[PDB]
Each structure stands twice: as C-alpha cells, then as structure tokens.
C-alpha cells in the first residue's frame, strides 16, 4: 500500500569534486586508487556536471545509482589517449587492458571518462602520462605494477642496461593540443562499487521515510528491494549481522 | 638526494660554440626531462630546452631556431646542451633543472658561467 | 608562445608584514605554474607548484593563489632570508617556457 525506504541515516558529501576535479591524474601505470566510504553519493549530480564522453556502467544503470547503498567504492583515475578508452571495459584486450589496467570480467561499476585536451595536452608535448609497454605476463585485474626495470626482450641480459634486446618498460604518450582527436588524452575515472550492501556505507541521497510495521509495504531496506510485512521479530541477531536469510 | 653537476666557466669568442654537460646523479634517469635555463646578468631567466629522457627526444626553445641541440648519454646518465653561434649577448650562466614529478624544476644545477668576448 | 607579466617589478617590505606579488599570463595557462626564488649567486629553488600547492622543504609561510590568467604569491610574515627575487614559471605550453620578469623584494 506504501513504500518505506529506510535507508541508513548519514549526510557526509562523496568526494567526488575531488577525483574528477583533480588538477593532475595519475599516469595509467600508476592510477590513483581513493576507497569512497561512509558518505551520501548523488550520481545524477556527478552524471549531469560536465562533457563526459564515455560513460559505460556495467552491471548497474546509470540512472538506478541512487537507489543503491554499495559497500564500498573505489574510484581509480588515470589518462588515457583516445584510441585507448576503448579498451577500459571488461573483456578487452591491448596493451592497457594488459600491461596497464585490468579491468575483472566480473566488473560491476561504471565507467567514466571525458577528452580532457585542455589540461593534459602542452604545446611542446605533456610526457607526464606513461604506460607500460613490455611485461612478461597480462595483468591481473586491479593490480598495479609500477616497476621500472628493463624488460629482457633477448637471451642475453640486460643487467639494468637498455640496449640491444633491452627496452625500457615504459613510454611515453607525449599529449599534444594538435594531436589527432583519438590521440588526446582522456581522463578516465573508473568507479567500482562492491555490490554487497551488508555493510552499506555509501548510498544515494534517497530521502528516508517512517517504518510502518503490521501492513503490507513495498520495504526497501538499505538498498535490499522486496515487498512484505515488516514484524518485530525476537532473532538473536549477533552485533555484526545485517539479515538474516 | 639528487644532485646535478655541470661542467666548468668556460670563455669562447663571437662566432664560436659551446657545449656544456649536467651530470644526472641519483634517481631514475630516464623518466624526468632535464630543462637549460640561461640567465644573462641583470636580466631574467630564460629558457632554452628540453631535453627528454623517456621520449628519446629534444626539444628547443621557439627563439632559438637551430641555435640549440641537446643531446645526452644514457648510460653515464649525462646530458649535453650544444649552443651555437655564440655571441656577446650569450654571455649567461646555463643552468640545468630537472623537471621532475611535477613538471617544476625542483633540482636546479650549480649553473656554468659561460663568458663569450674577444 | 605565451608571454607572462608579473607586477610589480621592484617591491619593498619590512620584517613581518604581508607582501603580495601578481603574475598575469597571456594565455589561460589552467594552474600550470610555478614560483621560484633566487638569492643573488645562488640557483633557484620552487617554492610554488600548481599554482597553489606548496614545495616540500619550503617554510609554510608562503601561500599562492590564482588559476586561468592571472596568478599572485603572498607571503604572510615577510622574514629577512625571504628577501631575493622570485620569477614565476608558465610550464602549460613547451615551446618555449616563459619565467617571469622578475619581482626583487627589497628592506624597506
Ligand atoms: C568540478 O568543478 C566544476 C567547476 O566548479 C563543477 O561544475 C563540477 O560539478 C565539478 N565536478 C564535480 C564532480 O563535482
């Protein structure tokens, strides 16, 4: 007859003004990870703030984001040449879904990423932003591997010398503002919620209402949908036990 | 603690060239871009070019076509600044920076006094 | 090529009071710049990245301000070893990077 969303009771602001508004991002090899945690996000403000070319949500609609309460969020930002942000997704293949950044097969979370070419392109070329080009073996998802060394291309070693079957793991994309319009750099920030709403600490803002208990009720309990009658019950519920199924 | 060390004064004459060193110590080499920076006495600075490690590449500065080459020894982790057509208004002390991190020259150089007269 | 203006060019203190220098670009250059300082006979050191960030090492009175054209370093207690000239870096466009024209801060 009614619906009550009860959702947990917290009014801290996600910062998300400060992983898609950061002045510099990680370079791909190195992407910044931040753990979003016990805060309100509103993703229809961060869906309608700007130019966002790509924004892939996998395993959840984009629009249903504020009626979710995830257990954590992580927001892995990094910048990636146009060509490239095709290969941010789950199931793809190439040198940044390999030697850079792995996304698992069994993502669930958004992806987003707009052409910023007017803050990681300089005239005489941005050489900030490197990506691995040489590993012995395809990443695993969610790792980062930030080491330096030279790849031994050749039977003989290279001893930490670069030279003749010797390369540095490591190039450069060199942004430019005259670049092609997939060869610019795009500032991928791909989010992550751990759908698993035991511990729900980030929501949407979802305003609460009052719990009727003894009539039916369309109850959407900290993220968990269903309809039924909502009773007192005396379970011995341990202190770290959100349901009981 | 990185430390870069330039090589000694030197003193040309008009119409000559100079060629000066910055000896890259410590850290990894191959990913900061090594930045010349001249200053002529009662002047500011000045910018000359670039020299990047991880590119394999040089870059010179628009009011100095040609003028400039820069060139660098990976293995002994030295970079060489080439000037040429030296004449009595290049008389400035050529700093080497490495433009590290954060594209700012955190790591400046001891800086050669380069005097060119007859 | 992107040419900067700082203003003013000459400025005098005393010991302990605020001081405030503007670096206005030419070009929106976002807040891609930097601030030195140069003790005569000595190599520069940054003291300003970003625009508003702080060097590590740097003493935390200085504090700068300012993105899209027009930039301003402040130092809120002006001290006697504080007194050399500071230029300020455009590092937005590589060909070629302009400094500043040099601001000497001088005893009043
Ligand atoms: C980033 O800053 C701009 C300008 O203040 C603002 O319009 C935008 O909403 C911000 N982005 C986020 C995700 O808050």
């Given at each position: 007859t009614e619906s009550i969303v009860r959702f947990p009771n917290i009014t801290n602001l996600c910062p998300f003004g400060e992983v898609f508004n950061a002045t510099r991002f990680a370079s791909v090899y190195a992407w910044n990870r931040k753990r979003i945690s016990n805060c309100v996000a509103d993703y229809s403000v961060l869906y309608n703030?700007?130019?966002?070319?790509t924004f892939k949500c996998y395993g959840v609609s984009p629009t249903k984001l504020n009626d979710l309460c995830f257990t954590n969020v992580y927001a892995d930002s990094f910048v990636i040449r146009g060509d490239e942000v095709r290969q941010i997704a789950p199931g793809q293949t190439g040198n940044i879904a390999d030697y850079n950044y792995k996304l698992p097969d069994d993502f669930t979370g958004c992806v987003i990423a707009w052409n910023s070419n007017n803050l990681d392109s300089k005239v005489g070329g941005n050489y900030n932003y490197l990506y691995r080009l040489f590993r012995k073996s395809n990443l695993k998802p969610f790792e980062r591997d930030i080491s330096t060394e030279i790849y031994q291309?050749?039977?003989?070693?290279?001893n930490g010398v670069k030279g003749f079957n010797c390369y540095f793991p490591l190039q450069s994309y060199?942004?430019?503002?005259?670049?092609?319009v997939g060869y610019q750099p795009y500032r991928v920030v791909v989010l992550s919620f751990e759908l698993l709403h035991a511990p729900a600490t980030v929501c949407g803002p979802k305003k609460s209402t009052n719990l009727v208990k003894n009539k039916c009720v369309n109850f959407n309990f900290n993220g968990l949908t269903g309809t039924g009658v909502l009773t007192e019950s005396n379970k011995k519920f341990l202190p770290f036990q959100q349901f009981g199924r | 603690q990185v430390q870069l060390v330039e090589s000694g004064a030197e003193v040309k004459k008009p119409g000559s060239s100079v060629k000066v060193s910055c000896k890259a110590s410590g850290?990894?080499?191959?990913?900061y871009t090594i930045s010349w920076v001249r200053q002529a006495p009662g002047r500011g600075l000045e910018w000359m070019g670039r020299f990047i490690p991880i590119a394999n590449k040089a870059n010179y500065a628009q009011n100095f076509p040609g003028r400039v080459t820069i060139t660098a020894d990976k293995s002994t982790s030295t970079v060489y600044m080439e000037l040429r057509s030296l004449t009595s208004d290049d008389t400035a002390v050529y700093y080497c920076a490495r433009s590290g991190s954060y594209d700012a020259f955190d790591v400046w150089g001891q800086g050669t006094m380069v005097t060119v007269s007859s | 090529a992107i040419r900067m203006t700082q203003s003013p060019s000459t400025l005098s203190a005393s010991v302990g009071d605020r001081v405030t220098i503007t670096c206005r670009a030419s070009q929106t250059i976002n807040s891609w710049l930097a601030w030195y300082q140069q003790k005569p006979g000595k190599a520069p050191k940054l003291l300003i990245?970003?625009?508003s960030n702080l060097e590590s090492g740097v003493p935390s009175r200085f504090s700068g301000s300012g993105s899209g054209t027009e930039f301003t370093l402040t130092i809120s207690s002006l001290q006697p070893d504080d007194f050399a000239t500071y230029y300020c870096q455009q590092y937005e466009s590589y060909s070629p990077i302009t400094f500043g024209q040099g601001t000497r801060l001088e005893i009043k």
């Amino acid at each position: 007859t009614e619906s009550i969303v009860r959702f947990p009771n917290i009014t801290n602001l996600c910062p998300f003004g400060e992983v898609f508004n950061a002045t510099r991002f990680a370079s791909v090899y190195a992407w910044n990870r931040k753990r979003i945690s016990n805060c309100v996000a509103d993703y229809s403000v961060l869906y309608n703030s700007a130019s966002f070319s790509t924004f892939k949500c996998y395993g959840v609609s984009p629009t249903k984001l504020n009626d979710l309460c995830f257990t954590n969020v992580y927001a892995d930002s990094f910048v990636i040449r146009g060509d490239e942000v095709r290969q941010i997704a789950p199931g793809q293949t190439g040198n940044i879904a390999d030697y850079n950044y792995k996304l698992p097969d069994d993502f669930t979370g958004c992806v987003i990423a707009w052409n910023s070419n007017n803050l990681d392109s300089k005239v005489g070329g941005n050489y900030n932003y490197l990506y691995r080009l040489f590993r012995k073996s395809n990443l695993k998802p969610f790792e980062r591997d930030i080491s330096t060394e030279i790849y031994q291309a050749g039977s003989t070693p290279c001893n930490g010398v670069k030279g003749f079957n010797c390369y540095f793991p490591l190039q450069s994309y060199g942004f430019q503002p005259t670049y092609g319009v997939g060869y610019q750099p795009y500032r991928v920030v791909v989010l992550s919620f751990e759908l698993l709403h035991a511990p729900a600490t980030v929501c949407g803002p979802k305003k609460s209402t009052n719990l009727v208990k003894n009539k039916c009720v369309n109850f959407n309990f900290n993220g968990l949908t269903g309809t039924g009658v909502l009773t007192e019950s005396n379970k011995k519920f341990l202190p770290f036990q959100q349901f009981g199924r | 603690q990185v430390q870069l060390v330039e090589s000694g004064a030197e003193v040309k004459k008009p119409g000559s060239s100079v060629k000066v060193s910055c000896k890259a110590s410590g850290g990894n080499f191959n990913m900061y871009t090594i930045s010349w920076v001249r200053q002529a006495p009662g002047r500011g600075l000045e910018w000359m070019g670039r020299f990047i490690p991880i590119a394999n590449k040089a870059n010179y500065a628009q009011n100095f076509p040609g003028r400039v080459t820069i060139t660098a020894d990976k293995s002994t982790s030295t970079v060489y600044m080439e000037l040429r057509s030296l004449t009595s208004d290049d008389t400035a002390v050529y700093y080497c920076a490495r433009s590290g991190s954060y594209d700012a020259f955190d790591v400046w150089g001891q800086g050669t006094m380069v005097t060119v007269s007859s | 090529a992107i040419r900067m203006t700082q203003s003013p060019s000459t400025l005098s203190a005393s010991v302990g009071d605020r001081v405030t220098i503007t670096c206005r670009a030419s070009q929106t250059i976002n807040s891609w710049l930097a601030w030195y300082q140069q003790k005569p006979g000595k190599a520069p050191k940054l003291l300003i990245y970003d625009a508003s960030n702080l060097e590590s090492g740097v003493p935390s009175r200085f504090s700068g301000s300012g993105s899209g054209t027009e930039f301003t370093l402040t130092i809120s207690s002006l001290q006697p070893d504080d007194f050399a000239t500071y230029y300020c870096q455009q590092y937005e466009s590589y060909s070629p990077i302009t400094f500043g024209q040099g601001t000497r801060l001088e005893i009043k």
